[PDB]
Nucleic acid binder design. Structure first.
Lengths: 73, 95
RNA sequence: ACCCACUCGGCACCUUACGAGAAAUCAAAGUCUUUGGGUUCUGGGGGGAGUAUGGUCGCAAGGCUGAAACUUAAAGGAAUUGACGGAAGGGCACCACCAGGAGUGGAGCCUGCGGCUUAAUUUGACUCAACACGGGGAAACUCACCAGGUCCAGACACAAUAAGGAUUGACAGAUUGAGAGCUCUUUCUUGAUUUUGUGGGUGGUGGUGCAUGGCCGUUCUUAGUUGGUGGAGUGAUUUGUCUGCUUAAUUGCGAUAACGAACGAGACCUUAACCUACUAAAUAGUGGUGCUAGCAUUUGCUGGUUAUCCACUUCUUAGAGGGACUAUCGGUUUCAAGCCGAUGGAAGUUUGAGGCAAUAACAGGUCUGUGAUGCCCUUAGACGUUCUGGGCCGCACGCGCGCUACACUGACGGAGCCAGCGAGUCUAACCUUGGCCGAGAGGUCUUGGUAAUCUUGUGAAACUCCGUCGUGCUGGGGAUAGAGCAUUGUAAUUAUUGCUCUUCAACGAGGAAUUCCUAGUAAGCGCAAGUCAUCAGCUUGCGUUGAUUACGUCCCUGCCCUUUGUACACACC
RNA sequence: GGGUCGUUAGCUCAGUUGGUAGAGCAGUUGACUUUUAAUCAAUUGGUCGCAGGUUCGAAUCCUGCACGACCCACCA
RNA sequence: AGCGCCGUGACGCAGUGGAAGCGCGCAGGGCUCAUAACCCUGAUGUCCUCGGAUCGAAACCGAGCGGCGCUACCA
RNA sequence: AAUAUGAAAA
């Protein structure tokens, strides 16, 4: 076949393997008490408070119930 | 050899686009034609649609109709009929 | 002059090979590695070259004598098997012709190829032996091409990263054709499966069909091909495998330094023709009797009705078998194989058509069928896989299969209206009956059928019968365009296809050329299957109607055998 | 010696009056074939032999020179 | 220096005031395995350029261009 | 009766 040449400049750069959140201890800051909850935790049965809901536009999202899970509280 | 030049193949484009009295039968009768038919079909030992068309200049269709009316008036005698040709005589007592 | 025998000397000849020879051949070309009767001349690879030069003869043309430089690996001789011949002999083929038929090539369109074009117009194939071919009738898929975007299904080993996390997925906004997080923003999710790298595999409708298997075609639809042991020859090789006659046949009868065999042909197998026979048959029928309908009115005729039953297998399906073996007769030839005519017979061309089909080969076609593969390339901004949209159809032209016609042997309308091969769904949706609705396509509600049971008697067309016509580019042809109506399909647009109305061009029997064809054959006429979701002008089959002319030839193109010539052997290109 | 004419791709030939280089051969590449040859397609190479007038600007117009090609060069 | 001539398809050459012909060559198509030849067809011409005259010219007459030929004798 | 030619190696 012909020698291949790309019209687009560059496209190999993938998303990173991970966000690199290091220790990921964003659970809560507490002074030797019961540390408790920083974010809320999902009410859906498929999670059962196993997940911290996200925040992208001041509304929250579940990465385990996943996709269109939307709360605005 | 076999492959011609592109200019020679342009002669495909240069090819360019260059490449290698009715009869007036009656079709409608008049008094004169009407007189003509009953005076002459006593002749014409053989009468059919084509013969009437050839020797009386009738437009074929009216030749067929005239044959039916010649049959109705009995001046004609059948030998055979068909949806595409009919054979007729002068109602001759000679044969 | 003959005849018979002999002799001497010639011109030769016939048979053999003791002998000679590389062989063809030779009574000399013998008496030759067992090499010596006498003597003259000539040659040392082929060309250069009988050239130059020097002589010499000649009126001249030229004759005699006669080099070298240089150049080259063969040149050449005799036989062998082929190939080939405008060589001969024999027998043959509608891929040959004759006598013809139908056509093509002339026009329009479908379709394939080339050329051109383009981002791509994917590609293999180019005399028979490529071009309605790759089962290739491509809207997405197919697809291999083009413009773009994903994904990895990169096995496994090791090294690195590394659960105070390897890695994965993310709604939404941007971006993108795109509810592809692909990538960016964002914070969540997942948790040893991975990721990165070194190796190493895996895929490829990527290249090579000239590196291969397999498959097919072709040589090659003709009758050809091979061993054993003998015979000839130093040997390649030859005979067997052939003079004649015959057969479709290397088929036989015969001949015979060959005998006996093997593949091929044949024999064979399937299908198509006869079966009042065996076996039968609510998935085929028929008749009779019941019940019923109509006319007759009737006694007879034509129908409907399987739980009305009974009988039967003629037609229909079959299983096993019979039959054909040129049977018999008359002619004709080693008088054999065989052939010709007639008789009978369902059939007397191998009874018809196919299947299978040998030795050897092509540098035929295919790695785009193959998880069959060698080698090369590539392997993650892959030539892998997949998604969106084009393309395979693009049009100045050339070519090849064809489908329409150019009309009265018709066109049209209304009747009669009769086949065969075959195919079809069930847990998935086929073949569809009947009813209803709509001009139509089609829509609608059900029905039978896993099928001799229902589609389906596939009630096909051509055909016939009765009417409109009119000799006219006309009601022939319906290409070409518009508008509209449905179907298949996620999607039709570069109109899938069907229908309605309108448009109505070329086409006047086709130039040089050229294809096919000997009887249910050509041809006309459609039907089924194939591919298929829809679509046929395509092929594979089937049936309806159904000719003319042959019954021969080697004149063109070719084939097989024998003889022959050859300076050909990648073989008359 | 004078008058005239012409010199452009590696080569050859057109050009054209004042807007810019065309054709063939050659060379490179690809197609083609087993590979070449041939053929085809594309590309390369051209300050137009050196100094002017301006048609804005010359390859072509014009004056020089360096090549060359022609024509003419006492006299009785 | 003077005078005369020619110029027409790619090539050679015709041809008259109503407009372009011949042969060759080219092109298609067939035959051929392919080429040649052969068979059936087809095209292609600012008639050197410009202007004028004419109803219209290749032709007529001017301009130009290119290519030719003749004259060049008496001393 | 006319019927010429078919590149180089393999």
């Amino acid at each position: 076949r012909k020698k291949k040449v790309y019209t687009t400049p560059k496209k190999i750069k993938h998303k990173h393997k991970a966000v690199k959140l290091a220790v990921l201890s964003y659970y809560k800051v507490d002074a030797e008490g019961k540390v408790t909850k920083l974010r809320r935790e999902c009410s859906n049965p498929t999670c059962g408070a196993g997940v911290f809901l996200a925040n992208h536009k001041d509304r929250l999202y579940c990465g385990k119930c996943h996709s269109v899970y939307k709360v605005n509280a | 050899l076999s492959k011609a030049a592109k200019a020679a193949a342009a002669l495909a484009g240069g090819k360019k686009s260059k490449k290698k009295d009715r009869a007036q039968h009656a079709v409608i009768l008049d008094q004169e034609k009407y007189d003509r038919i009953l005076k002459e079909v006593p002749t014409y030992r053989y009468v059919s649609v084509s013969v009437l068309v050839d020797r009386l200049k009738i437009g074929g269709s009216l030749a067929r109709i005239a044959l039916r009316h010649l049959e109705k008036e009995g001046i004609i005698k059948p030998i055979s009929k068909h949806s595409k040709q009919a054979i007729y005589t002068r109602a001759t007592a000679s044969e």
